[PDB]
Symmetry: C6
Subunit: 68 residues, 6 copies
């Protein structure tokens, strides 16, 4: 399920970790995860934007992180 995606995203959110989100088309977004639900992530940095999960390849934290 999301039995893993969620605590991971939530850990990045809670602790305000800088991340790169890579999109399926190769576009790289940077920021902190402000919030998220089942389908979108709200990314904040130089401009705030709502990102669709279905368009995301990877989420890469800038530092190692406690895992579920």
């Amino acid at each position: 399920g999301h039995s893993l995606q969620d605590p991971y995203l939530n850990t990045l959110r809670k602790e305000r970790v800088p991340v790169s989100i890579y999109l399926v088309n190769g576009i790289k977004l940077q920021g902190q995860i402000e919030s998220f639900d089942q389908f979108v992530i709200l990314l904040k940095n130089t401009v705030s934007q709502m990102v669709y999960k279905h368009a995301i390849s990877t989420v890469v934290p800038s530092r190692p992180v406690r895992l579920p």
Copy 2:
């Protein structure tokens, strides 16, 4: 669920906030959200059009949105 996506689109809709919508294929659409449902967004501006969510990567508001 859609606990985040929906109040976010509704606030954009209600406050007529100009948005940029970036499609998975890199095309940028521009305008205001007239309405939406689970699967599509109705975008009005110089050009009015129905946009399938599955083709959307990000929604970038022209100014930040305060959620309820």
Copy 3:
């Protein structure tokens, strides 16, 4: 849910409005919506072709259209 997509496509259909349908790969199709269901749209012209909704980015009517 479908509260917008259905009445929007049904209106375009009943009114025989010429539409531009942009595919996810950038290609543009033009014609009239002959019919549609959950997964496909039948686009009328020289022949009526079947278009999977999953392959569509946007539907753009040639003229402004209301949905009373």
Copy 4:
């Protein structure tokens, strides 16, 4: 699938020559030999299985009776 199935079944049973445009822009030609919910067997020189998720459009070479 109230439209897709009778439409593909007409194409199959009348052995109508078709074009299948894929989401990446590749164009396949042949005839529909069989299909189910997820795949179409496209028949020709070499026959092949096409995933509907990779199809953008299905374009018959001639007009065909339309499901009503």
Copy 5:
């Protein structure tokens, strides 16, 4: 519903038929169907690699195959 895909893939597996698998991105994989489930295919050659179906456009056997 799966009355084509399963028996097609299973015939290709049982008979160890050389196949080409084309991905939506243009990549051409070659080998033989080792096993498959609802979502992935195990494609044997130098190692058995897991191919996600959603990434596949077509499956093309190296020779014709009689179905059950």
Copy 6:
């Protein structure tokens, strides 16, 4: 057959810690070890553990063959 192949296959690569290559839909090649996975994502370990959406993966390729249970 549901996930009767994908789960044990990924589980094998996880438990045996076999290095894999994960190719993305856009051609990009990621490399590391499968730390864990759920229905939707795979955690890929190297410098940091990045999260890979399955919907963006075309293939997972083990650096060396392995066997299913």
